[PDB]
Design a protein around this nucleic acid. Sequence first.
DNA 1: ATCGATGTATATATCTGACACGTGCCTGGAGACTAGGGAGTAATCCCCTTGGCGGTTAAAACGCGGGGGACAGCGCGTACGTGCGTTTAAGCGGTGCTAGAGCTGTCTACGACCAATTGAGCGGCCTCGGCACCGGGATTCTGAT
DNA 2: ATCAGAATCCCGGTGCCGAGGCCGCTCAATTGGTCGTAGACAGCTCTAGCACCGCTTAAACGCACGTACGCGCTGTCCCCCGCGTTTTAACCGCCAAGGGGATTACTCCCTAGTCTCCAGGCACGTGTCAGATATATACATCGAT
Lengths: 95, 96, 108, 108, 97, 97, 79, 83, 180
Amino acid sequence: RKTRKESYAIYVYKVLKQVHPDTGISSKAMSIMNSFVNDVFERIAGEASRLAHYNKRSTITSREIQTAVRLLLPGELAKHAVSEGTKAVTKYTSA
Amino acid sequence: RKTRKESYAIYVYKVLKQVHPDTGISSKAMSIMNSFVNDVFERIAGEASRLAHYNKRSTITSREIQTAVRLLLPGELAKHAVSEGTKAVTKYTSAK
Amino acid sequence: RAKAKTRSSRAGLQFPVGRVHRLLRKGNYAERVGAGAPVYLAAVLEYLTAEILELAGNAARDNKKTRIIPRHLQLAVRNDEELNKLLGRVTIAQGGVLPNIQSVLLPK
Amino acid sequence: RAKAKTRSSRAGLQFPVGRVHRLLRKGNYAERVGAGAPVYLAAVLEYLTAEILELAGNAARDNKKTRIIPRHLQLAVRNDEELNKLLGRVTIAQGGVLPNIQSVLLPK
Amino acid sequence: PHRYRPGTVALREIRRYQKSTELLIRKLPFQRLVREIAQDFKTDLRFQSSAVMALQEASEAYLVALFEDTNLCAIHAKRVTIMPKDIQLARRIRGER
Amino acid sequence: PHRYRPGTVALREIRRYQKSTELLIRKLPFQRLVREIAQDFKTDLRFQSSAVMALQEASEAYLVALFEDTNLCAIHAKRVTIMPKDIQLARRIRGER
Amino acid sequence: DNIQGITKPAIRRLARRGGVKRISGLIYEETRGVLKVFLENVIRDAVTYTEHAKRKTVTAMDVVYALKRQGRTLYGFGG
Amino acid sequence: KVLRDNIQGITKPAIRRLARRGGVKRISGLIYEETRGVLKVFLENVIRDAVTYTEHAKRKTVTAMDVVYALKRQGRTLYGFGG
Amino acid sequence: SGIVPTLQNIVATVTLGCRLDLKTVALHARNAEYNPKRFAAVIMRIREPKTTALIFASGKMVVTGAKSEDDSKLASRKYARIIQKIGFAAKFTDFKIQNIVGSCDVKFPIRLEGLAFSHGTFSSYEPELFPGLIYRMVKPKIVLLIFVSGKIVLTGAKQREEIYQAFEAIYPVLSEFRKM
DNA sequence: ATCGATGTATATATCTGACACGTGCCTGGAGACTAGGGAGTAATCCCCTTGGCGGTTAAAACGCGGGGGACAGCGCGTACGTGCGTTTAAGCGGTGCTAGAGCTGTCTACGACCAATTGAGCGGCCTCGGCACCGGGATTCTGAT
DNA sequence: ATCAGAATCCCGGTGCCGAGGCCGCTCAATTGGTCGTAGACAGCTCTAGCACCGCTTAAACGCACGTACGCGCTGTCCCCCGCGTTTTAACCGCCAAGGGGATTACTCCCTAGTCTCCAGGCACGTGTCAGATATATACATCGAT
């Protein structure tokens, strides 16, 4: 068997079946979605790395990711992404 | 009293006196040279980090730095920079 | 005795907080990674995925093809204003372009 | 314990190999840093510094000045072909521009 | 007989090729071009099929965006025809020269 | 009296301001503009002097490079006068609009 | 309205440094709008960098980092 | 083996098709050699970077990943071939 | 109403049940077409009476374009004897009339907007993406395409009584939705 | 005006490879416990940002003639678009094979870590010479003639 | 060509302040030793890329011909430039304050590290169904008719 190679396909699939509960998705669009998620991950984590190194911090907190989201994403997308992320962090710390 | 902020000012001054023993340099030009060295350092080290992550290695070697220099810098500039780096690494390995 | 439990369920997420956390630690982004950072980041990735997939599903419904192809993602990204600003220097393969013709080329 | 010969002297460099090694280890660029990597990187930084400072000293001598000011570094960078490609998305403060006027604006 | 005016079938081709998603350069001449260009950098290279497909998608996206900017240059000069100076203006304003 | 042809003292002024390195916007109006713009993002903000100076050097470098690209647009359209459509073409080809 | 404080002579000086011979009269309001958009982007990112550090003064390093994020790297104010 | 006369394999109808996707109503005759030179310059840049990535890996086949990294290195990020 | 909807397209399917070859049917007939990339089956057309022929190598026969149901039966019989005289064995079993298409005119325009607002669950109208209005009642499986002019076309039927009952069933709503 | 050839938006038919989904496995993610050090907080201090006064001068605002450049109209000729017959090579479908991608195992060189040493680099102070402003003469273009 | 005339450039003098040098200090690099681990090398597998070959057919190519568009020329008028006058507000300097940013010290809680364990996610098999694509019916358009 080939060595395990992780991918974001299953998650993007669950998000698609929540949002559009009857549509499918091609495998090429799947690879596009996987590379999109990886690219935005690299962008936000790189800006968080820069934010931790600028302020002489050694940890990446939710504040560094939140500020990196405000820097990377455009305006209304950034407000809604900050709202969804804060909602998820509160739901995580409450449980 | 204040924090001993690191800076490349004395090394840029030594290289300037090595290549131009009577020419000096202003303070704003010294800050531009310091930020230039910091910027090129961050570029080459960032691309060396990328090269180490793409090949699933955990060590930045001189091969990663050589390839990152060959990627960042344009042609004749990159070949002379690779020549300088190879001469310096061989001189470092010949010594202890 | 908490035999089955995951972090994504606690944070009400589908995206893996464990994989995101492992990628943040193995990516050499910092020396340490806080506990809420992969939760927040997986939420942001989930929101951006939901926005692009929503607009691509709307494009697919408009084009009457159920499956999402690269063309629908390209139409969704280039037709949204803020997603085109996020992905302005990004080429989506097999995506084509927006059908835009300049007005001075259209005839009488 | 013999006399502590500085690593920079061994490699035959003016730029600090030890400081570059400390910045590579504290910069979270990778988990480990090889021994020849700061030597190579300090050599490349010294070569690029020497190239810019040579061309800037030439520009300052052509302007009959002794000190290098930002204007001389800007002339050195923008007059070289490959340094303009390396610093194409870089603004040098107090540097001005190259004295270039388009041909259609020059008169009879 | 029948004859179209110059420029109507051109707009029909514009609508067709902006409606479609296929690759517009043919695959084997592009692959031969890629191998000759790679020949200078190093010898005995083997190219994965996906690599040449990625180079073709990227190259055609680059050329399509450059022709959009070239069309903006030509319309700016009160023209409809794109000239090579339109490509030169687009590539200089982009930062490529 | 005496009178120069229109464009000669302008070209000499071009040579003067391309020879010099000074800031061409005056400091205090630019600083007031920076603080007014900053006010909406967050109230009660201070600025270091070096911050305002850095913003001036970046803003003037951006505007000077945009006026070079605008000049290329105007020369491309067989003009010498720069129009606002030249600025719009320069900002569209760079990828800003 | 201090956006008008970016005067017509200042825009003419910037265009002369850009090598512009003749300037139309509608250039100045568009140039002021362009400068306001540029400064809005850069100042928004710099104030984001300032609020992240829990500071209330915008330092020059925040402006320099904000410029590098745009890809308009600036030398001479740290880095 | 040995390859030549291939940039003219990017034919005049192919350049016209790419211009039709670009929304170009009418094309000069001098466009095609300029476009072939531009495509040659772009391919030289991307292929030089891809070769450097290939060599650094001590490989001899240029993978899709190498091209994708060579395009991300130039700000021409390409989705759909890996990550 | 009272007027019989004129039948336009009678699409039926008959099974042949034999092993065939494509080159001999493609060469031993008249006015045939084979494009391998589009279909792996040979297409053909017969002028008297007009019906487009659709030949499968597995022993399948699809007739379209008949003017009436008896016309489709005689067309399938004609295609069967074509298959018999070229040299295979064709039969006349499992006559599946899956599509009956009829058209007529009510001679008066019908206000589409009223049927869209009163029957938003039953219909949907947008001026630039679909000028026809879709209607589907529940006792048959049927798709309707009432138009601005008042053109009414039915399809997907198995027997012409369905188009008759559906025309008399849709006649009240368009009868109270007249326009001039 | 007109008309017909060409795309287009809905009806059924079958066909197909890719997409959905079901399954086994296993290895990565989760529970639990630990230290320790990084981050949070509180007091302090000083420096550097804000704010004001004043003058004053150089720069901005404004008016106006005019000239030269934008722009609209026009003619032309030629280069490019359109269509058609020919040919050429791309695409596709098999065949074969072997370089090399990729994975596994081993082990040793090599880099993290740690303690002691110490000397390079940084902060601070001082000074002098390069540079900047001012005045004048000389040269350099500019423009009408 | 020539000459008056603004405008820039060279030379010299006065000043001044910032770059260069020196000295104390301190902390960060060096050296010496230890230990885990990672990647260099060998070797095996088996994938997929290359090389070739034959057939088909659609795209490329060469050419004829017409015409729309690029380009050059001309006139006009408008609106931007050059310049003189008035005004105004930036700049320099100087001072005061206070506030917030940097500093140091103490604490505590949050994350890496390690061990166990199991179940999500990945590779793989398979089945079936979205897309494709041919035929009536109906409708915008486009340009010769």
